[PDB]
C-alpha cells in the first residue's frame, strides 16, 4: 500500500504538513577524499574532507514543510510554533538502467536493482544536517529532488609550513565507511519509513513581535522614586537627578538588552570590502575563521528613511549578517557558474522592520564628558584607555533578548555540538532549533551492480552498471503550535507586511513569461518572509 | 575523550551553502554578498560560537621582563591587584608543533595565566633547597594539550584589515581612536559552546562552590 | 526480508563482527585438470591438480572480520580471543546476462538465472580453506569480491623417469564432481545462510605479551640452594658452584624453552639465496619440500640496533620466516605480472619486538671447553662428532613456549589433517586455530544455461549463455573474548606500538593522491599489526 | 577488625580505588594568628589568617586515588568519569611519646 501523501492540517494544538516528491539517486563515485590546502595570503584553510558514495536527505527548512499559504495561515492564527515530529518515507522505488550505446542512451527498468537506506539513531557518523547548505526539495512540486551526496570534514595536524598551510593528517583523520553498518536493502515495490520525534524540551519560538520598547515600560505619569547620579559638581557635590516617568532614555531599568556587536551597517560606503565580517582567530595576518551571526541581532534592519516617508526605505545590512540565496526555480541554462567566488546578487535579506525588543544600537557607553579622570590621559603608558565606544556590548547577569525570528527559509533544527558545557545552545544563531538528538541523517545509496567479471585478465574492474533510482520521498513534519491570544486592545493591529516581489507580481506564484514563453518563472519575495506577525506585550 | 571535529568545520564539503554572508559594500551601497562553498571552513557562517577566550600571549613576548601578575581584576592604578589566573577554560599550555622538518622537540607555548603543577620531591633527602626564594620553580608539569581542542588556539575577536570602520573611524568624540579591531577577552555570547579543561592526572578532584547567591557554570572549576 | 548486515559489537563475553560485500560469480569452465610436471633441476614437483566449475568463499583471516579500529579495540580492552562462531549468508542474488554484440557488450538481468550453493558438513571434498592463499574480501568495502574458483591437488604414482619427475596417475587419482551432491538451487530473491560453530575445545589465544624472561623468575636476593657442576678440576675434584639469585643465565631452571631452529637471520649478507629455507626431503639434489615455519618462533625480530638508539631498527628476517603479501587495493593497471617467479617487494613482515618468552637464541650447547673428551678428536672415524653447535634445539619433556601471536592478517582457522595421531595440532605454525571440523567450504556456481540445441547437426554444443551472478555476501563471525585482567603494578604500561606506514600517513585510511588524482590509495602498515598489546606475568 | 585496604577495581559501571598510608600527627601549637601586612609597592595584600592546633586530611587529587596504571586503564577502556563517593578511615592509631 503506497499512497501519495500531501496537504497540511491545522489544528488548535498541532500543525501537520506533508509533502511527496519524486527523488533521484545519482550514482556517486566510491569514497573519495577532497584535500584542499589552505593559504595564509588568502583566507583558505586546509580541509581533509571525505566524499561518500552515500547520499542523504536534507529536509531541513521551514520552506520545505510549509506551503507559502500554509506559512501565511501559520502566522495569522497562531503563535509559538515548536516542532513536534518528523517522518520520512521512501516509497515507489524504481531503478532505471542507463545503457549508453552508439545508438544513444536508452533507460530501461531494472527489475533487479536496489537501494540501501539506513538512518543514524546513534549519531555515530558525522552529522551534516543543519549547517544551511543548499540541498533541499525545490519549492516547486514537479522539480525533481536529486539527493545530495554525503561527505564530511575531518582535521589532521595543521601546520604552517610556508605562506600556504597544509594538513599532514598524522592524527585525528577519520574514515567512515557507511558500507559497514546495518542498512535495509530496498527494491522495486518496497516501502521504508523512519518516524522521529523532537525532544519535548524544545523552546516555544514566538511568532509575534514584542509590543513595548524594553526600556520604556512604566507609568508616564509618576516621577521615579530613584535618583540616578548624573555627575559630580562643586568638587564632591555628586548631584542627583530624579527622572520623570516620561523620560525613557534616562530611567534606570531592571533588565538590560541582550548582547550586541554594534557593527556598521552601510555606514561604511567605501568600496573596500571586509575579507571576513567577524573572525575569532589568532594570526595577525596568518589566518582567521568567521563567526558571522555572532549574536542574535537583526541581520538587516528596515530603518525607514525620512524623505517625506520615502517609498523605498534604505535597508541596512549589518556586516556579519546573513541572507538566504535565491535558488533557481526550474531555471534552465541560467546556471551562470562563470560568476566565481560565489558573488550573489539580490539574496533574501531577512529584513526586520525594527519592531525589535530594543532599537538598533551601537555604543556601550557613548558619552561626551571629556576625560574619565581614571586613566584619563592614558593608563600606565602612551595607550589612551577605556575608550568610550566599546564594541561587543557583553551579556550581563540581568539581561533580556529575543533570538532571531523564523524566516520562511529558516532552517528548522541543528545539532548542538556534542560538548561538555554549552550556553543557550537551544537557540542557534543562524536558525530555528538547536537539538541534542536531531533528526537522523538518512543515508541512501544505489545497491551497486558491478560489470561482467574478467577472467582475471586485465585486473581492472569493469565500471558499475550505470543506473539511477527514482522514488517518492514522503516527508511529513508535525509542529506544536498555540493559537494567538490577542492582546486585548481597542485598535485594529496592522498585520505584518505582505511579501513583495521585485517583479511586483504576487509572491510564490508562477508568472507566465519573464522575457521567455518557454517556462514559467516561480516568484519569491524580494526579502525573506519573517514569521513575526502581531504585537504582544512584553 | 577528545572532540573529533573542529567546531567551525562540520558540514558537507560537497554542497555550497544556501546562505550569503555580506562580505562588504561596493560601488556605494551595492553591499556585495558571497555564497560560501562547503569547503570554505573559515568563511562559513556558523550556528555556535566558541567559548570565551583571553587571547593571551604565549611565548610571543621573548622579553626578559616578567608580568608581576598575569591577569588581575583590581582597581588600583599601581596600588593593588589580585590575580584571576586561569580566568577561562583554555589550554594552559599548547603543544603547537614546530615546523622545522617536523622538529622532534616541539615548542611548547605556555599561556600567561596558565598554571602548572609543581613536581613534589619524592622521598628526596636534603634537596629541600629552600634557599631558592620567592618560589621560583623549575620544570613543573605543564598540562600541555596537543591542540586536539574543540577550536584551535586563537587570539583576536575581530582581526580584520579593512582600514577605518567608518563609524568612529578616526576617533569617537575625542582624540581616543576607538573600536580597535583587536579586542582582548572574547566574551561569552548566548549561542556558545566550549569544553572545560581536561583532567590532568594531578587535577584536583573537587572544590567547594563558594556559598553565594548566584553562580554561573560553577560546577566546572 | 533481506537486510544489509554490518558493524561490530563488543561485549565483555563475546565479539560479534559482521560484513556484507557485493560478490560476483564468474562463469568458470568445466572441470579441467591442471597437470604440471616436476623437474629435479628446479624444485618443481609433479601435481595432478583439478579445476572445478564451482567456486567457494574463503572468509578466513582476522583482517576480514575485524575492522582495523575493531582490531584496535580488541587489543586495548581484551585478552584471550577465541573464535566462537561463523555465519555466512548469500542474499540479494541477481544474475546478469552478458550479450556480446558487434554493437557491444550489453548486460541485462536474467529473470531465469540461478546459482547453486551447498556446504560440506561432511568434509567429503578436499578441504581447501586455511592454506593462506589469496582469496579474500578486499579491505575496502566497495571492492567487489569475486569468488575464487575451486580446485584440488591429487597425487598419482610419482616416478623419477629422467631429470624431470612426472606423475603417471595410475593410482590415488580422484575426481570429485561437486555436481553430484545435494545443493540448493537459488535464484533472484532467494536467501541462503549457513550458520557454523567452532568447537568449544579451541584454546584461548592470548593477546598479551609475557612479562618475564623465562629463565629469570626468582628472588634476586637469595642464593640458590642448588649447586651446578661447573666442571672438573684437579683430576676428579668436580668443582661445584652455587649460583646467586642475580645470576640469570647460570641458574638451573625447571622449564626449558620450546623448540627452536636457530636459523640465520640477515647474518648471511651473501647475495646467494636459499633455494628453499627448510626442507625435509631425501634427495641429495633430486628433490625437497619446504617446512617453512617449522617451529613457533618470531618470523622476524625487531632487534633494536645500537647506534645511539638508531631511529630505524634493523629488522632481522629469519629464513623460513613468512610475510603477508600486501594486496593491491583497488589498484588499476599496477598488476605488473611482468615480475615473475613471484618476487614480492615490501611484504608485511610480522615483526615481533622481542617481548618474547625467551630472547632470540641459536646454539643448543655453545661452549668453549675444548674437546668433550668423549668422542674428542673423533668418534670411530675421521668424523669429528658431537659438535657443540646443534641446530634445531629439540622439544624435551619439561618445556614451555608460546605460539606465534595473532597478526591482523593471520588466518583464523585451518583443518587439522585427518590423521591417526597429531601433536599440538591445535596451534598451526602459520596461523590462528587448528580445528578438527572447520567451517565448511561453501561451494557456489552459476546454474548453467546451455545455448540453443542443434538439430543433431554439427555435434558441438553451443557454449553456455555468458552470464554472471552478483550478490550480497553476509559473513558474521563471533569471537569469545576475556577482558584483560591488568597486572597490578604501579607503572603505566607502554602500549603496543601503533602501526606505521612507509608513507608516514595514518594507517588503514584513504590517502588522496599518490602521484595520481584518480583513485585514493588505501594505506596499510609497513609491518604486520601484532595482536600482542600489554604485558602479563608468566 | 582492622584490615589494610588497597587496590582498585574496575567495573563497567564504577571504579573503586583504595589506598592506605601510615600517617602522622605532629603536635601543632595552640591557636596562633598569622598577620602579614600588605604593601602596595609589592603585590602583598594584608591577611589576618589563623593557625589551628587541628590538622586535616586533604586527599583531593586524582593522582592520590588512581595509581598511574589505574589511571592508564581509566582512559583506555572508559570515558566520562564522574566521582561517586569518598570514604576515609583512620585506623591502627598508635601514639608515641
Residue numbers in the entry:
A (entry chain M), C (entry chain c): 15 to 552
B (entry chain b): 222 to 442
D (entry chain b): 15 to 111
Copy text verbatim from the article accompanying this structure deposition:
Aleutian mink disease virus (AMDV), a pathogen in minks, and human parvovirus 4 (PARV4), infecting humans, are parvoviruses belonging to the genera Amdoparvovirus and Tetraparvovirus, respectively. Despite low amino acid sequence identities (10–30%) both viruses share the icosahedral nature of parvovirus capsids, with 60 viral proteins (VPs) assembling the capsid via two-, three-, and five-fold symmetry VP-related interactions, but display major structural variabilities in the surface loops when the capsid structures are superposed onto other parvoviruses. The viral capsids are critical components of the viral infectious life cycle: they protect the viral genome, are the determinants of the tissue type and host that is targeted (tropism), and remain intact while the virus escapes the endo-/lysosomal pathway and trafficks to the nucleus where the genome is released, leading to viral genome replication. The VP monomers of PARV4 and AMDV conserve the β-barrel core motif (βB–βI) with the additional βA strand and the α-helix A (αA) observed in other parvoviruses.
Three-dimensional-image reconstruction of the PARV4 capsids, utilizing a total of 5248 individual particles, resulted in a resolution of 3.12 Å, based on an FSC threshold of 0.143. Overall, the PARV4 capsid has a “flatter” appearance, similar to some densoviruses, since the three-fold protrusions do not project radially outwards and instead are positioned towards the two-fold, three-fold, and five-fold symmetry axes. This results in very small depressions at the two-fold axes and more segmented depressions surrounding the five-fold channel. Structural order in the density map of the PARV4 VP started at lysine 15 (VP2 numbering). The amino acids in the VP monomer were generally well-ordered to the C-terminal leucine 552, with the exception of aa 380–401, located near the three-fold symmetry axis, where only diffuse electron density was observed at a sigma (σ) threshold of ~1, preventing reliable placement of the amino acid chain. The PARV4 capsid utilizes VR-II to form the five-fold channel; VR-I, VR-III, and VR-IX for the two-/five-fold wall; and VR-IV, VR-V, and VR-VIII for the three-fold protrusions. The fused three-fold protrusions are caused by VR-VIII with its subloop leading towards the three-fold symmetry axis.
